[PDB]
Design a protein around this ligand. Structure first.
Ligand SMILES: [Cl-]
Ligand SMILES: [Cl-]
Ligand SMILES: [Cl-]
Ligand SMILES: [Cl-]
Ligand SMILES: [Cl-]
Ligand SMILES: [Cl-]
Ligand SMILES: [Cl-]
Ligand SMILES: [Cl-]
Lengths: 430, 430
């Protein structure tokens, strides 16, 4: 596993962002303000991760053309409270913003997470944001080669509410009281070659409310129905058997995601949240109750233990987040830990697990110091030396003694004898 | 005078053009087809002229955002004749296309000439294209720093028809029978630093038709009225005295152009067409009847003589162009020679002349061979070696035994002890 690139880039206006900024005519004030609040962070991420210049420009232009209009209204500041939020509170970030850039610091790859929204999203005209995500994926599909939507349609049919089911949730608003209303989210994985890999995420909590089927049964029946070839059947069965063991409760099946490629090559990730945030519970999940203890499983768990200590995670029993914690809102915010399970079409009996720890509310500078300690432990030299100062460079006017919102989640997997660490960070500067 | 850069670039899809092409969503089919027919030529021009990568992207993006929508309907092919034209026939090129990229091969600088048009331009809704150029310059002005429109307004008021005068030309179409209907044209000079210098050109032949004032009196009264400080007064007077000498006819005042900067720093170029295309007439104009024979004037004229022979220009008496010669139309096309006079605000008694020879209808490959001979004569080594193959690389599928439309005009001046040569070339690939 070749160590990740990390070049320094602290510049407040990186050259590609300026070059485009001085050339773009925006047909919307919102698109213009979004750009100036996020494009500098994207541009820095791209040059620090050592993407080629041509590819930097491809992606900043794509950001401009495809993403900006899908971000909807620019966030607004409350005069007296100072809190800055958008009317639709996205399930993608705890700040509720519809945009997030994530940094795979094991490979130096950037991903753009987008909750496609309109001015009507959240309001009476569209209270569950049904159509705009689809339109976004459809547009991405015609623009971007290799983007195959067959998996999205199959899951949309099973996992997203129909127009009648909406009416039931409008007529009777007591049946779905959660403010987390996002059904679909998107992600574009930006490869070094210029190719974009698109993923869709499905959150069927509203379909659950209207049909009386639990989130688990929806996810599993969905996956099981779409899986014609039965490539996921073994891993899925054993994940179910594990969720069964756990129910006989703190483990909660939450959502899934799928890639958008040829069906017989497609791969799904099943997400579950866990509220006992402690290292004995991580082992239980990581090893499926001690059933999955091959060398690779245990070697990864030893390293997971090192990671957990290095970033200084606190143990605890943490309940699902009450509302949101938007910019201006104060965080020491505590939330649940999370796992995805990778249904990969291999012959492995168990799908590969990936841990997501919510670090939102932990001092972000401190957290990144702990990560640096971890980068050194695994010999990621360039990243050890340069990442922290690139991290802080994205939040120029911010106070890092108080700031605990800059990193929201960190994920850990073990792939090819190596740690895989991804930071999900604050992607917005007013 | 430091010799011009010229790097080779023969690639059919240069990297910046691909990078943008794979990222742009076009809200118009016309903008999309325009882009694919012209952006490769612009991208090649920019890398051969050795512009920085960031600046290449600034300008290709600007092309995309500001220019593409101003090009109006994509040109259409006639099934039986094969001729390819746009409904509005632009006065900017003999092909009638609203776009032209010109190459200053003395400095390696590119300029974008644009005739801003809509789907309505030329038709009953807008037969003289009055508003769209203004809108373009106004948009460029808010986008681009340093663009000052005070000069444009002053000349627009004097030189472009009012809405009543239009009505007179519609009601009575016999009063203006010329198909050259463009009143305003634009040019963006792309500097190496990233700064864009915008010029406006004014063609008052229609205002002439409705007011009964000759083109000359319009141009001179216009310049004279706008010139508060009297910076142009001496050069203008002597140019008039010369036009007077010539009338007492083949010399014809045609149009002017102005830069768009601070007024007291502004500079105008007065254009006139000459139909005795021969070297004795060039001397007469160049030296204002033998009144302007300082060493710089005569040293430039010696070099002009070399240029004229090297590109193998044919002498002759040539009358103004009857209609257009569009793509698919056959050229050995003969047209008038042309001169501009640079009213520069200096203390010189005479404004600097610049010759424009119409080479449209001369074999373009042959012409560029003759230019290469000229580049060598003046020691422009890189340009001598690489320009021809960069020229031909812009017209990939074309036959260069017949092709005489690829270069339309070539201009010659003498600035700072050195030749200044600019090619005005075909900027479109179907
Ligand atoms: Cl590079
Ligand atoms: Cl429906
Ligand atoms: Cl149902
Ligand atoms: Cl803390
Ligand atoms: Cl460069
Ligand atoms: Cl008017
Ligand atoms: Cl008048
Ligand atoms: Cl010839």
């Amino acid at each position: 596993p070749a160590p990740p690139d990390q070049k320094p880039c602290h510049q407040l206006q990186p050259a590609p962002y300026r070059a485009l900024s001085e050339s773009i005519l925006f047909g919307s004030v919102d698109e213009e303000r979004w750009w100036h609040s996020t494009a500098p962070i994207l541009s820095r991420l791209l040059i620090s991760s050592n993407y080629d210049v041509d590819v930097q420009y491809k992606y900043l232009s794509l950001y401009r053309h495809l993403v900006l209009p899908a971000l909807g209204p620019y966030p607004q500041r409350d005069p007296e409270t100072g809190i800055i939020a958008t009317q639709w509170r996205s399930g993608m970030v705890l700040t509720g913003l519809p945009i997030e850039f994530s940094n795979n610091v094991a490979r130096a790859l950037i991903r753009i997470g987008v909750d496609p929204v309109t001015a009507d999203s959240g309001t009476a005209q569209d209270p569950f944001n049904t159509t705009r995500p689809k339109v976004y994926l459809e547009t991405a599909a015609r623009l971007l080669p290799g983007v195959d939507l067959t998996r999205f349609y199959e899951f949309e049919t099973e996992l997203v509410i129909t127009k009648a089911e909406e009416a039931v949730l409008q007529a009777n608003p007591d049946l779905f009281r959660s403010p987390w209303k996002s059904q679909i989210l998107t992600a574009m994985d930006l490869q070094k070659s210029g190719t974009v890999l698109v993923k869709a995420y499905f959150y069927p909590q509203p379909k659950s409310a209207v049909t009386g089927r639990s989130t688990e049964d929806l996810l599993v029946n969905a996956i099981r129905k779409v899986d014609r070839e039965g490539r996921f059947e073994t891993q899925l069965a054993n994940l179910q058997r594990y969720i069964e063991r756990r129910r006989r409760c703190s483990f909660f099946p939450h959502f899934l995601s799928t890639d958008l490629v040829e069906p017989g090559k497609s791969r799904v990730k099943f997400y579950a949240s866990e509220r006992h945030v402690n290292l004995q519970m991580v082992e239980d999940i990581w090893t499926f109750g001690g059933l999955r203890r091959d060398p690779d499983a245990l070697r990864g768990l030893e390293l997971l233990r090192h990671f957990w200590a290095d970033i200084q995670m606190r143990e605890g029993y943490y309940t699902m987040p009450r509302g949101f914690c938007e910019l201006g809102k104060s965080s020491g915010f505590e939330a649940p830990m999370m796992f995805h399970f990778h249904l990969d079409g291999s012959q492995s009996p168990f799908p590969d697990p990936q841990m997501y720890v919510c670090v939102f509310g932990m001092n972000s500078r401190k957290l990144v110091e702990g990560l640096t300690t971890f980068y050194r432990r695994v010999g990621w030299e360039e990243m050890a030396s340069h990442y922290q100062a690139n991290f802080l460079a994205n939040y120029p006017d911010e106070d890092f003694e108080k700031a605990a919102h800059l990193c929201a989640y960190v994920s850990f997997a073990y792939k090819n004898g190596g740690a895989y660490v991804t930071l999900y960070n604050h992607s917005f500067n007013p």
